[PDB]
């Protein structure tokens, strides 16, 4: 039933261990990417943007899924340091252009007839 094959994790411990130095690699990644890619957003801005993206993937409770997020997570940092990505790619997570989607009931009610 619950028998599934691993890729990198058995227990949440080592699963949370992988996201630890994944943060560590990403934590030290911010100071170089902002300067080398010539942005405008601040260093701590990037650091918290890395931070928050962790919190989005926090409600999952399966060692089986987190590592899939880890490999997806580790599938991006090298794309930044080795100048593979571009300014439109790494500032994209800095969601800037789009207008702010209304959150309260009235403002959604006013904008359109959609949920």
């Amino acid at each position: 039933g619950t028998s599934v094959k691993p890729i990198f994790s058995r227990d949440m411990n080592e699963a949370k261990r992988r996201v630890r130095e994944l943060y560590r690699a990403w934590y030290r990644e911010v100071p170089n990417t902002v300067h080398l890619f010539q942005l405008d957003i601040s260093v701590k801005q990037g650091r918290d943007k890395v931070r928050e993206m962790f919190m989005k993937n926090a409600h999952v409770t399966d060692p089986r899924v987190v590592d899939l997020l880890v490999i997806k997570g580790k599938m991006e940092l090298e794309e930044t340091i080795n100048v593979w990505k571009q300014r439109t790619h790494i500032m994209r997570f800095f969601h800037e252009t789009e207008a702010p989607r209304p959150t309260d009931f009235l403002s959604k009610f006013y904008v359109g007839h959609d949920p």
Partner: protein
């Protein structure tokens, strides 16, 4: 007359801008065949003063040819910015000008004009070589319909 001298100078300034403009490519897809299949002897374009040459700093018009994917979108924009002024872009092919076949797919922008200010649109899938040659001819005629020095003098 004051208007006459600026009229003669304006013509002289843009008489050969429509005859010495040199095309630039990016050659994305099957439209990149007619791109230089016109440079083939049959539909000679070197005679028209135009001649294909990349040299993004030293070219006049770029003939955007092929399907514009999102992945390349930075590359075109950085090329058009590096493009010196005056500059024109020609959207060859249905995919380049309006997405064409792949308009509904996830990895192509629906038309090049969503990315670059797009001049004369030459349609075709692909545009048969002379259709762009006709399109290039329209671009040169558009160059005559310009009042650059006239507008400056009016101001």
């Amino acid at each position: 007359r004051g208007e006459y001298v600026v009229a003669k100078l304006d013509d002289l300034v843009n008489w050969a801008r429509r005859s010495s403009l040199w095309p630039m490519t990016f050659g994305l897809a099957c439209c990149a065949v007619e791109m230089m299949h016109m440079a083939a002897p049959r539909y000679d374009m070197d005679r028209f003063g135009v001649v294909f040459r990349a040299s993004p700093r030293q070219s006049d018009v770029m003939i955007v040819a092929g399907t514009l994917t999102n992945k390349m979108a930075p590359a075109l924009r950085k090329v058009y910015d590096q493009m010196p002024e005056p500059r024109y872009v020609v959207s060859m092919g249905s995919c380049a000008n309006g997405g064409g076949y792949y308009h509904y797919s996830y990895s192509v922008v629906r038309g090049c004009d969503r990315i670059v200010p797009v001049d004369i649109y030459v349609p075709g899938c692909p545009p048969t070589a002379e259709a762009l040659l006709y399109g290039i001819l329209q671009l040169q005629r558009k160059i005559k319909r310009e009042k650059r020095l006239r507008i400056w003098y009016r101001r």
